[PDB]
RNA sequence: CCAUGAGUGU
RNA sequence: CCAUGAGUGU
RNA sequence: UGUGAUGAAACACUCAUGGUCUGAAGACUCCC
RNA sequence: GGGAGUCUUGUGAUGAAACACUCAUGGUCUGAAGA
């Protein structure tokens, strides 16, 4: 029975006592060791290990890692694994030393110099494949979208309060922020509004007239061109941001269908991404029970209920789903529970590779919703 | 199936279904994929049972990963209808968990040790 | 200003221009600071000011930690190295002789740990999940101290698992108990009792239990010896 | 002795008993009444009242309003005023009726139709001069400036988190948000970075090299042109806001010097405006004690102190004054107290008219600060 | 649905599709709402839902206001008319016969009062300071009800001053007592007592004192008669 | 001066300074423009006293406006040095307030009624 | 920050 | 929402 | 309908009004 | 330690909790009935 060790130092064989029966030293090469460590994660044995298991011809071998076992069985040996074995410890107890003994480095001084730069290079490598995940861009974009949303609203509220010094009646006449902004942007003074320039936005015959009459009889302030352009800077920023938003929605749709098609099928690009952003990743979203996915967002609401034993939230960021916020209060809980349930399934098929099944999921959901509403 | 990590002989699969039934009676079990998930996340479960005929495979695919992080052992059975109907339900179940074995302690400890042997170990 | 040694190796206190007393360590990389900390020269030697509000180890010291098992040439496995605030200080304490293996699984944060560990030959960064010591088995050795500050409900179990992998027999474990990330509902004080029992029910011999208040809310640190 | 009444209805003379001795009815004209009511506020008598005080030749007259007295004395009469006099009440008690009696309207039906439209027009007029105050624009502008400040920071924070997927090393290398944004805006990919193009914005020799080396050895992610331009939309928005900000500052400076020069002499346009914003107007700031001015902003901190008897804030929005936030903590309360005192005087000379005296105010303030600093 | 009269003139209650009861008034301008309120047709007559959470008068009714001095053809001086929420409901109650004089000194808000008052011949808007009744002396007449809801520390004194100008002897005053804008420090209940005393030490005969809770925190309304 | 609303004859001006001194002794006064302001804003002040030789006039200009809103009577004296030195100070004061008259009630009531007469009234 | 009245965004 | 570690703006 | 029934507090903003510190000391120098 | 003066100070001495954001990690409902 041979206990086998894998390390940066190479591959060592030990008996049950803790004596080095035989060893094969690794090459002192950053490139190759890094790759074999990355490879060892998937179960793939070191090439120093392959050579060692040939030199010694052991009937029963035992390794450190459970992922290696089936690989070494495919190579011809009878194999098991012991986790925190006495031998693996015995090896590491003498690890400052046995680097010199098996001639991996001449002295301790540059065993560590090497090991340091391996660790530097080995994490540098992991840092890259973490950044290279496609879901991270979905997350950032939706976050920036929620920033823009927030800003559009802040500026539009500011603009209306501001521009209302000059033309106060326009505020209650234009519900839509984008329209409001377009007016302050395109015209300036209230006395510069004109019919055809307004017909061009989409304003119906009748409204144009109400706006113009409002401007004529306006009890607003007469103001300089310096003052107006100051306001107009905000208006143009608002308009810019609306274009950037729509651009970001399309970009987001592209990534979201690529990275999580099943989830996207259920709740759209934005809300799917939003759920990714609260969970942290797609793989984290997948690992969640529905009862979590149902309340993501709403954490203040959740932990209030958990601390005091009061009433929990019915829905977190899921509230944004058309079926929920439009539905009466007593139906919301059930629609949320059903959505979250399907979302969890959607996340898992998305995460663990499975090809698009969002159509039957939607159909299953809309069935459940139609039943809820017939009461 | 591809979410099935190792091979369970039918003698074991039956001893699993038995262990669960005694656990309904004398201990505490959790039934259903979402409740099984929470039991792992919370570290309450001693044994996790997963069915081999779940019909989108990926529904339970996260359990092997989750169970290994929290180091809770898991086992497979062939029929979901059989596991649910073990569970004291008249409908199927894709996965279940034993939180407290009760009068199945000896029965469970043999299972969590047989799945160790047919996994590697010693 | 005056700087002088304390009961613990390579850890010093300052008398200040005003009359305050702050902890500091001997700067292994002079002219260079890891977070925003003050650099102080005294008798031509440079010290890094060790803020207790940021570093739970300094906190523990100021709350009267009996004996500190981190010293000159100590080998430490450091679970939850994060941005490198505390681990930089144990780098200073340990000096070029000893070694510190910094396990951390959040890339957004190991980003900044890199910068600390580049400048510091003591520190061996690892982007790995401390729940699977198998995934860093191949880089580390056995160690004298297992310093564990990880935000995880099963943080104590994780620590024990690493211990039986990498902690020398008769080695020491400094385990940070984060009540509010084990359970926000339970009383921090119930949690401290139950997590220490896990260590005792393994075979760790509780030496000292400190409550990190002022400096850290709902936290405690345990010093115990592995057998 | 004649008790005189002024109303929309006209000018009526009563004896001490409450009997109409003589009256002169107003013209039923919205234009003229409104103006005479606006004028009455400043103490100017109705023109109907002037005619009435001639027809009757009274020795001792008594009016309703104290502002009228000196105006009627200049016109030849001995005059006083009684506030809530029995006579004034007697008149209003019969006011539905005595409109018809003095023939202001034929019936009650269109006394109220007229009075309704007078009220409508009389408030329409007041609403206008309110809107016409110049300090309101100073307030709006700084409020938008503060929104822009807030947004720049939100977007820059986002951009760095986002763009660092591709080029993480650039974040700790560029402190300045505007600079960081300029780089992502002009380049996107890190392999588009050149000594030439970077010199063409004034980055210094040594820094250009550190950037390019960091881009060369970057452990970032390789990423599509679609991904980068998404990010670059934010970068350009950030750049847009910086320009808009600088424009708003100059505008703000223009208005602030005009509307409150002495205040602006003390704390600058922005902070000056900011105080106006919190106070609501210049005249409101002028009515304040220093001890209020000193704490504006910081309301949460103040009322916490007032409810519990704890320690109060040393400074509210005033913290922004360079002499305060740069100074050590034991000097700040004194500096704040001295500033606030001067600001109260500054606001008052600004409010109750004209003169610039901001130079001595600054001189007195800097004397007080120099003393504080010598301990 | 069912609408029926209550103890008070032109004030109605609704039975609803589900079994809820809400106050409403008879719509003086049918098809048109001032805030977001529900419009309701019953037997070809339209009513405006009177939300108690917005209107203090609706609140006071739902807290059992004995007798409401605002009815058909009443003349009211309304101090602090604001955006027109409550005053629009007193316009409905008072009908074309009666008159409401809305005093309000915040231009930002009189802006929206204008719109309410255009549609309604009942209401006579006034942008003036209730502290100077001289500045509207010349537009108003004497009145039956002095309804006073103004956020001012000396609100009570303001109310009394307007009263001796405009309130008819034996007329009624509904005075809203805003504890938190008289003094956030003092106890709301100490304030209600001391303000009522100001009315009594003038000569107002306290009829009823209601606490507006659920509907308005730290508020009380006083009904009293001027002598 | 322009912030001075009406004319105060020296007999009255002296009766005011007297009223203030007795109020230091037997009642409660506030001294200084900021403290006087707060006394009006809070409605505590019964009588407000403003000096005529304030040197930037605008320093106390807000008081007439503020006192009228709160309906607190105000009066003038000719010297700020004289008002402060009345107040129990050795330096000047621009404005002061009487919160409780104490042993000057009769003396104050005569002042608040003389300034009514030379203002209009009856 | 507390209170009142009026609104906005996902 | 609570806690920990890292940072930003006026 | 355990591939989730039943119950059950989603999140982010803006404007207007009022409540908005303390109150006489501190620093120097000269004679025995 | 006793005595004496000078400068600044109610046009404010002395004392005394300014505000707004971002990232990372963990703590993240119920569980068999319904028409
Ligand atoms: N399972 C796990 N493995 C490794 N690191 C983990 C972990 N769970 C949480 N962490 C990390 O633990 C850290 C807690 S912060 C620790 C602070 C640091 N030791 C200091 O004092 O300076 C976080 O950075 C978090 O990402
Ligand atoms: N001195 C004063 N004169 C007139 N109105 C005042 C005032 N002080 C405060 N107010 C007004 O009082 C109002 C308080 S809100 C009043 C609510 C309204 N009556 C309703 O129920 O619908 C504010 O609009 C404020 O501007």
From TrEMBL, chains A, D:
Domain Nop: from-to ranges: 259-374
SUPFAM superfamilies documented for this protein: Nop domain (SSF89124)
GO molecular function, one term: snoRNA binding
Gene3D superfamilies: 1.10.287.4070, 3.30.420.220, Nop domain
Coiled coil: none
Gene Ontology cellular component annotations, sorted alphabetically: box C/D methylation guide snoRNP complex
Superkingdom: Archaea
PROSITE patterns: NOP
SMART domains with a match to the protein in the record: NOSIC (SM00931)
Family designation: Belongs to the NOP5/NOP56 family.
Entry-linked NCBIfam families: PRK14552.1 (NF011121)
Name recorded for this polypeptide: Pre mRNA splicing protein
Species for this entry: Saccharolobus solfataricus (strain ATCC 35092 / DSM 1617 / JCM 11322 / P2)
UniProtKB/TrEMBL annotation, chains B, F:
Alphabetized UniProt keyword annotations: Cytoplasm, Ribonucleoprotein, Ribosomal protein, RNA-binding, rRNA-binding, tRNA processing
Function: Multifunctional RNA-binding protein that recognizes the K-turn motif in ribosomal RNA, the RNA component of RNase P, box H/ACA, box C/D and box C'/D' sRNAs.
GO molecular function: ribonuclease P activity; rRNA binding; structural constituent of ribosome
Domain of life, source organism: Archaea
Subunit structure: Part of the 50S ribosomal subunit. Probably part of the RNase P complex.
PROSITE patterns: RIBOSOMAL_L7AE
Chief site of localization: cytoplasm
Family statement drawn from the similarity comment of this UniProt entry: Belongs to the eukaryotic ribosomal protein eL8 family.
Limits of the Ribosomal protein eL8/eL30/eS12/Gadd45 domain: 14-107
Any single biological process term in GO: translation
Protein known as: Large ribosomal subunit protein eL8
GO cellular component, one term: cytoplasm
Localization per Swiss-Prot or TrEMBL: Cytoplasm
